[model samples]
Target: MEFKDFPLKPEILEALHGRGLTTPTPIQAAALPLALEGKDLIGQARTGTGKTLAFALPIAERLAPSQERGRKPRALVLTPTRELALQVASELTAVAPHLKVVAVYGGTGYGKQKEALLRGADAVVATPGRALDYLRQGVLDLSRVEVAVLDEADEMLSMGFEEEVEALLSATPPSRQTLLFSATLPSWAKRLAERYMKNPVLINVIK
Candidate 1:
């Protein structure tokens, strides 16, 4: 499927064009329509399968006209590792530079992280543990989020952040659009969707 086939903002289309991104990845093809309309869902796609952009595109698009210049983030993506956090944030920044984006993780210091949140962001890509710490300390707010994504949820469960992610989700607005992405849906991940998400639809980028 082509990126142009989706009804995206002209700016978004331009950005993909700039990146020479025309064809949608298997995950992107299946996930975009559901995600674009702000549906709560689970996407299971492997690494290097363009899983990042599948969620990133709709998340960024849905976040248009960002209002967080004086408030909390409007969208949050929880990754299991610092590298994944940075990578997701970077990709979002690349295509959506107009949106204030940040990546937070441990060892980055509380002061800098706090400042970033205070500076205001439309989107935040963060590791679960570090994000949970910020939430506990009142340095970050989940109340304003319109969309929440758990990327690589299998790793998050392996790292024991499944509980943390669920806790964060509980704090997020009930009206928020929730998305979970993983390479595979083990029993625990299935249970997580069954328990936390709001009647989620499923989109498998079947490899």
Candidate 2:
């Protein structure tokens, strides 16, 4: 299906078109409508199935633009590593050029990331450890988060990030939307969803 079939904002459509993204991948087609409807979801798709855009589209479309300075991030994306954090942050920025997105991860100093957070961000793509560190330092705030996403959730769970992930999720408002996108669904991750998510819709495009 074409992206045009989805009711997306003009700027989002423009960005997608400019990126030569006209058709929706299977995962995108399945997940976009649900996500855009602001439903909590557990989406399972293999690597190379365009999972990023599947979530990115709904995030960029649903989050309202903030005019105030030093605004808390409305969206939070937790990844398993610094590399993935950076990758997802860039993709989100590319898709939603109007939004201010930042990547927070370890293996770097605090000055730049701290400054980015201070300057304000609509979305934060972060690793659980660094994100928690910033949260403790009061440099990052999740209380205002509208949507919290766990990307590569199985990897995060296998890496023993369950506690950190739980802490991060707990920091967000209880009413926030939660989305989990993973290449595989381990039982523990399913349990995590059951505990934290509000009757999430399970969307699997893992053929």
Candidate 3:
């Protein structure tokens, strides 16, 4: 079904159309509606399955119009690597052309991240370690985050970010909508889901 058929705002529908996305991907079709309804989700799908948009579309739809004129990030996306964070932010930019987004990862200047945060971004895509660094330094604020997404959760765990991920999740609001996307749900991932997620709708998409 088209995005318009879902419970999305007009601006979101227009943005999806502008981005040349006329139909939902398999994951999106299965999860977007439930996510928009504030249900936590754990989506198991392989890479290149349009999982990012599946989570992003719901986030953009849920976000209130920017109260500030500029770019304060209301959503936080945790990825495993800097390149992936950048890529996710780029995709989000395409999805919400009118919104401002920032990518924070290691191997970058702190000045740039600070400036981006100060300027305000509608979304932030970052590696777990770097995100934790900023959070510890009192630079990035998680208290206001409406949506929290863990992209490639298993990969992040394999990269040894389990503690960092838990710390980051601790900072966010308990009531926030949490979404986890992973190619495979390993034991650790299941442990995480059981520990953190609250009645999340588990969706497994077959290729």
Candidate 4:
């Protein structure tokens, strides 16, 4: 099906068309409905399988109805690396409707990153270490996070960020919808989902 078939704004549809993204990839096709439904979703797909947009589109969709409220983030996306965090935040900024998107990672000075959050953020894409630091300093608040995304969860696990990931999830409200994506099966991380997510549906894409 076309991107137009999904529930999205005309401008977003236009943007997708302008970006030459006329069709959904296999993973995107499988994950779109569940994400749009606001369910706790788990997806396993390859790294180059358009993984970012699979979640980004749905995230932008979730934030479509409202404008950026205050300084607190409405959507939280955790990535394994600073580079990935920047890319994810860039994708989110491109897709979302004038929403403030912040990229928080360890490479930069805390003051600048802190100012980025203090000003405002509709969505935040961050790496574990940097995010944890900001959270500890009360620079970024997850209490208002409506949707949580753990991108590249398996890589995060392999990178020894399990504890930090757990802590971050714990900070969010229990009622929040979660979406986790990984190229590999870190079955141990399923426990993370079990503890935090409620009856999540897993979708696998191998095409």
Top lDDT hit: 2
lDDT of 4 at 183: 72
Clashes of 1: 0
Give Cα-based local distance difference scores for all models: 0.86, 0.91, 0.86, 0.86
Over 1-207, each residue of candidate 1 has an lDDT whose tens digit, in order, gives 689888988888899999899999887888889889988989888899898998889876887665646578989999999998989999999877668888999866788878989878788899988888989998888898999989999999898887788888888988889899988888888887887788898887664
Q: State the lDDT of candidate 3 residue by residue for 1-207, as single tens digits.
A: 888788887777887787688888889899988998889999999988889999888777777657584444678999999999999998887766666788999996799888878777778899999999988887888888888999999999899999999999888888788999998999988988888789989999965
Worst 10 residues of 2 by lDDT: 198-207
Error at 21, model 1, angstroms: 0.4
What are the TM-scores, per candidate, against the unseen true structure? 0.95, 0.97, 0.93, 0.95
Candidates ranked, most accurate by TM-score first: 2, 4, 1, 3
| Candidate 4 lDDT by residue in tens digits, 61-163 | 8774445445688899999999999888887888885578889998778888888888788889999989999899888899989899999999999889999
lDDT for residue 17 in candidate 4, whole number 0-100:
89
Q: Flag regions of model 2 displaced more than 4 Å.
A: none
> How many clashes in candidate 4?
0
